[PDB]
Amino acid sequence: LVVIVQADWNAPGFF
């Protein structure tokens, strides 16, 4: 749900 690291549930980051 953030921008850093691979990608989360929707956003391109976990951090």
* Residues 6 or more apart in contact with residue 3 via CB below 8 angstroms: 11, 12, 13, 15
Q: How far apart are CA 11 and CA 13, in angstroms?
A: 6
Q: Do residues 2 and 10 lie in contact, with contact meaning Cβ atoms separated by under 8 Å?
A: no
At 15, list the tokens: 């951090």
* Residues 6 or more apart in contact with residue 6 via CB below 8 angstroms: 12, 13, 14
Q: Do residues 3 and 14 lie in contact, with contact meaning Cβ atoms separated by under 8 Å?
A: no
The approach used to solve this structure was: NMR
Owner of token pair 């691979």: 6
3-state secondary structure of 13: strand
**DSSP one-letter code for 2:** B
Residues after which a C–N gap over 2.5 Å breaks the chain: none
Q: How many CB atoms lie within 10 A of CB 2?
A: 12
Q: Which amino acid belongs to residue 5?
A: V
